[PDB]
């Protein structure tokens, strides 16, 4: 153990949200050094008293004030010169949150903004490569697991769910087949509530229950 | 950067091979401390002069003498007490090699043995959890990419290819549909060579060319 070097261990969060048709990431225009004024993911460092997963949770809560967040580890990024300051190996995670539900004041302190995932600014270091990989993993996984519902409020319309999925895959779906495919899922249940987008339009709301899903975990959408 | 701790950065390789129907891992019965006499993955440590990926390659070559090996990063394992000695965060990779082709002498020095992935001994620390995750990733990926061919010699029979796939999924396939599905792949080409398993039996040999695959990269098996 002792003849080997030690490394600063970074945490970087790719924070996904969904709103009005598009998938956005929560990014920081850095107040601080290095690369001041440039865009980046939310970052921190693993501490001696916490696991790497717990560091991810802390860093995310620091920005958002959110806990019990769906998170996935993306990977350990460890090119020698990835960060020009000192050597840092960073573990990237992605997170899927409800965009109506984070802590606005914390976001303001970090000087963070939501940006459309298809219209991102240049990001520092190897952050573009972290985003690319997290996207692929998320697309891969959201086609066989119900992880997408973390991006939606507890109650959602089918129009929104469809729109979510079109945004995830950058491709429009057949409305007919989609609606059917959802009706065949018992754990996506139709409620007797409606979304009132303005005085003159409504739409039926659904909810996902993970009890019904976990008793029969079949998902493909 | 400087107010944060630094960590020993481990490398752990899950080394997959394929032979006579079954998938095996190359494991070490440790000559050395800690946990002497117990079974583990092949490990090392990231050095100051190498990227994390390059450390993975080195550690694997140390045991096998192999280079240009198909490898995938599995993840950063960072529970505080994962390794009871000092704190180590370890990056697990998996590797897919041709079992006829490694360096026997290096394997002997490390006191490593091939073991059936379904009949593994107890492994130390969080190595079981690394193996579990690498298996899932490998199964997931080998169903949509031609990564399986790294586990086979350059020339293979369809009987072997089938057998490989049955072992990957722990499930027998329909011989008929399988054979057809392969005929529909131009990049799996039939040669005029035969495997001579003993004096009295042969079978037609095929090869994968990644040129033909990369020009039209469609794979599902």
Author numbering:
A (entry chain A), B (entry chain A): 5 to 225
Task: Give passages from the manuscript.
In this study we identified and characterized a novel L-arabinose-responsive transcription factor found in the Bacteroides species, which belongs to the NrtR family of Nudix-related transcriptional regulators. In this work, genome-scale regulon inference using the comparative genomics approach revealed that the NrtR family AraR regulators in Bacteroides and Prevotella spp. control not only the L-arabinose catabolic operons, but also several other gene loci involved in the utilization of arabinose-containing polysaccharides. The predicted AraR-regulated operons are involved in the uptake and catabolism of L-arabinose and the decomposition of arabinose-containing polysaccharides (e.g., arabinan, arabinoxylan, pectic galactan) to oligosaccharides, their translocation into the periplasm, and further hydrolysis.
We determined the structures of full-length apo–BtAraR protein, its complex with a specific DNA duplex, and its complex with the L-arabinose effector. The solved structures provide a first view of the structural mechanism underlying the regulatory function of the L-arabinose-binding Nudix domain. These observations suggest that AraR regulators are also enzymatically inactive and utilize their Nudix hydrolase-like domains for ligand binding.
